[PDB]
Amino acid sequence: IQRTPKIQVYSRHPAENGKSNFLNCYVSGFHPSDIEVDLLKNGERIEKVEHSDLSFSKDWSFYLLYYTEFTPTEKDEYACRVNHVTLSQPKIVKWDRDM
Amino acid sequence: GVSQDPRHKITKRGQNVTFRCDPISEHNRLYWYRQTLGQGPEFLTYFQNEAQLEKSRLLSDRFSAERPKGSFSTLEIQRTEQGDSAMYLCASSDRDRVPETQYFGPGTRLLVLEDLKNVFPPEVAVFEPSEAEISHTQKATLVCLATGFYPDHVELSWWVNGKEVHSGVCTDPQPLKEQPALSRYALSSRLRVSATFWQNPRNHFRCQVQFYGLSENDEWTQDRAKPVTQIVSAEAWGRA
Amino acid sequence: QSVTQPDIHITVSEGASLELRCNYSYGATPYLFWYVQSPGQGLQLLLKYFSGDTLVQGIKGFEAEFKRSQSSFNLRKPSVHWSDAAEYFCAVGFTGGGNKLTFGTGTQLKVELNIQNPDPAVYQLRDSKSSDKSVCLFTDFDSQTNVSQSKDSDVYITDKCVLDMRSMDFKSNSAVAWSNKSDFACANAFNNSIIPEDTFFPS
Amino acid sequence: GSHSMRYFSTSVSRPGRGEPRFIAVGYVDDTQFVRFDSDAASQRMEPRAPWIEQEGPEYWDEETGKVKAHSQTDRENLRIALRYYNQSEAGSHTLQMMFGCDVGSDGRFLRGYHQYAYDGKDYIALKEDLRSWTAADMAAQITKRKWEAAHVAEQQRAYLEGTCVDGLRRYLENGKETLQRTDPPKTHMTHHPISDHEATLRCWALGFYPAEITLTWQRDGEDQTQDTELVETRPAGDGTFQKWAAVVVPSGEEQRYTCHVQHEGLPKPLTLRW
Amino acid sequence: RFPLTFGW
């Protein structure tokens, strides 16, 4: 069987421009395992990306956490790009600062 | 039920060694152990049917063990030294039986030398009982003796009419040093049967002493016979 | 994470009760084994216990009992045979520490003969055509007789070992000595050792 | 307080792409401390928490061997599962495993868990008594029969009550600075309009540990779930968690809406009003 | 500590 991933985009600390923070893209309640996740800056793929270790919830659906180091500005576009076999097309979630 | 090969091996210091272990079928695990002279075995490593999972960090990297095809294991230790001379054990388990019983093999005793200046083979002779025993016991006690061998790697057996017998047979548990201040070895053995078994000349008697010594790959540099693996036998007939 | 084997050397008379202790660290409930190692060959498994039956009956008449209140798994045998003289190891596998076995310090056990009809004697056996030495045999002597080893350089004396004629149920001790000296006879070999006054000698 | 330890494993088969990707992680109640990825070059159990680095080289040498066996024990296990379900040897499937122990306040054993999974569905689970099993399908009843031929229960039962618990307090008392303490959340409220007289009210609570927290939007002493969005708990990556609750209200009615936060770290349940 | 593992 298959599960549809739930995606969230958010920051470790409240938004303060110029001061370094961390961006997280959380994948939850999803199955199967093999999935590709990347973080984009204004459409540019960010190279230095680290990911959490693979675990799963009580319902055997996995959960992951992709984070990277960044510094927010006023105009820059950040978003999380997700591709999965459960997705016919790669889905992107825009980052909202005060979502 | 494990089968190991070989049992006794002797080398000069600073070289490599190689033994094999052919454990039981349908057993997927293989533990290697090292037992010093008269002590608890020391753990080396263990496999699960394909590859090496754990190795004692207190053992150097020159210890190489591999079980490629998952049926038999291989062991290789480089730069032999006398501090490693001991008995090395091979064991197998199932991992599906919860008690996880390990069954060991006959093992392999290692002796490292700084130079092969000590190898001398044994000589065997048989001694017949005196009538004073038969005049007092109606039973005869025979003796086999080993003279001047090195090292203490022997396997003594008796044969009556071509078949091994064990009733009324005793042997020294340990060989001695003929020169206790250095030192060729010596061993003793006895065999006791009734007078009618003895006073009948047809009964055959042979003292089988198979010696674990040099192999064919070894090079002999001394002006004497090569002390290769030998089974030195001495026989006797019954007497009237 | 330790295994304790208190009995490190035991010598009893044949036919008596026997118990060897083996205590492990008061931690988890680990695997338990008792291995015997004959002096020459490898280890032979006697018994094991993890199922939950505190009493285990094993091979060679050996039975073992598990007592978690004492954390002991002690080997037992009702009457020890004469052949049980070997080194006895208790081996455990610490469940959380991997399936590798943890072996004990080792117990060396010997058995003295409960001799019934002592009859000491000394015999000079026939020299064969392939030797220059006359050999001697101290047999049918009482078990508690200790042989003082030779001090002359050209005389060898052995330690006692026991034979069992399984057919007739006869057990006797033995001790051999030999020398290549021409001035050597068997009657004048065991003078270094203590011999009973009633020991028979050839006429 | 009540804490636990979990062990999660994951084996994902891949035809022709080498040995299946094996990922095993070690989890304390809500903090990960060890991991093992098969495709990494180290091939040893690597720590992921500071306080667990006290354990000597024997610990890593032991934990490495025990899990590398589990990789091969599960790799060959899949080749049996393909025979059990009569699948194609060129198909891709996933194997999952979990079992750990929960304890009480003063170190008392509380509960025992053990559950496997095959492609997102349960295969075999140890019962609450820890001395019996529960196979899901007829294919699992084969393995269930084996594991009954051997006495697997009283080994895993003695483990879930023993070395799982006996080793747990060693982990906690090594790191009582980080685990046993609870960080209360940082709470605030935002305000976001979408039209002339309709806006979105979102209640924020950041930086708390652990993740068990309850949020409820109430209107004049009456709770509300209609027109309310509550996202699942999300981690910060440093050891804290986040969660927001949303409610859309028309203009002029904002002051009556109340956000309430209930959490273990707070001695008193918070009451927030805009 | 990581417990043991049995095949099917």
UniProtKB/TrEMBL annotation, chain D:
Location relative to the cell: Cell membrane; Membrane
Disulfide bonds: C101-C164, C203-C259
Entry keyword Glycoprotein: yes
Record's keyword terms, sorted: Disulfide bond, Glycoprotein, Immunity, Membrane, MHC I, Phosphoprotein, Signal, Transmembrane, Transmembrane helix
Gene Ontology biological-process annotations: antigen processing and presentation of peptide antigen via MHC class I
UniProt KW DNA-binding keyword: no
Domain Ig-like: 185-271
Membrane topology, from the record: Single-pass membrane protein; Single-pass type I membrane protein
GO cellular component: early endosome membrane; ER to Golgi transport vesicle membrane; Golgi membrane; lumenal side of endoplasmic reticulum membrane; MHC class I protein complex; phagocytic vesicle membrane; recycling endosome membrane
Chief localisation class: membrane
Protein family: Belongs to the MHC class I family.
Official protein name in the record: MHC class I antigen
Residues included from the entire protein: 25 to 298 of 337
